[PDB]
């Protein structure tokens, strides 16, 4: 009846005021959440953002991460104080049909992330081991056994394995930056919140600073990682009777989550400066993983003789594909955990990790093998580009399931009927939290029309455009109705 019954309140190791060892104990949840924010689904968008705007968008990244650190912490709080995840709170404060709508929506979000990671991992196999593109996908389907071995290890080593992947993809991209020797003064100048990133005048590569900045801000959080954080935050036993120990617990999970999401921010920065210093100006013409592979393997694309010799040897591209692999291993863990959370929390369905990863992976790979089937039917022409367009088109479900995950979180944590007058949010995080939630909801509701119109490709059929407008209006209006309904129920609880 409690979230993550297998590993809920497992190891509690606060030992008086020995704070840093205590920090070493529970440092796992923050990493499990942060590794999701390093998935390849936006890697190109960073590199592109670096080529179109050298170091300019870095500050935006920071801001985004900060916002991601805020809401995530809130989620952790809901897990630590209430001893129940976000899905159990929402489902407990609304009917079953709303919990079912939220269930299918979040399932579609984690399904979208799973699509990004199966595409990135399959391509990673196509680049490293030269496995055929169609075989690499059905090889990625075999991650259920890696989940079976993953199940017997334990969170003290699983949550450290996630750290291992994090520093793998962090040191892979940091190594290519160390060889690049970039002008770190311009990097520092770019990290400052300047007003050149909010303008619309450069328009390099069909992208203005305000478009890229609002895109980075719009994709701030992932809805599934909120339920994930609220669930894994409970894995540390708390008496819930001593205010100093639960306040200490909040400091604990906060410093952990910031320590890891800061690493994710560092990875995004390494991707932007990867697009600025490593690649030449405008050298990246194919945002696909294969385009970045050949671009990292062509000496004329880099801006340094050392990177030209190393690129000719073929080490940059292989490290890139290794980073694709280490990033593609995330949904096997966080996808199954979060899927269990929303499943047994929203619809009260107890399913094993076997059929979970089976169903999610199959539903994820169906459109992938359809895309590879059509493109390979065209002669393997534009197959990687179409895989990239599938990966980017999949991210609409996140915008569909974002407000129904950030609004109920902020409401339930701001109310005293769930947190109490002692552990509710400060008047500071009320203003910042509501501002962030409003901005993200508006920006994603704007993104719905752009992505739905993007489903029809870069060929604008005049009759299909109006249909995209009708479908977009219907979707955003339906999300408005669901949003005001959830607002009404939660505000009826408070």
Residue numbers in the entry: 13 to 506
Which of the paper's sentences describe this entry?
conserved and function as secondary active transporters. transport proteins that include the amino acid transporter LeuT18. μM range and that metal ion transport is coupled to the cotransport of protons. of the prokaryotic SLC11 transporter EcoDMT.
mutants of Glu129 and reduced to half in H236A. different role in proton-coupled metal ion transport. does not function as primary H+-acceptor. the pKa of Glu129 would have to be shifted upwards. in vicinity to the metal ion coordinating Asp51.
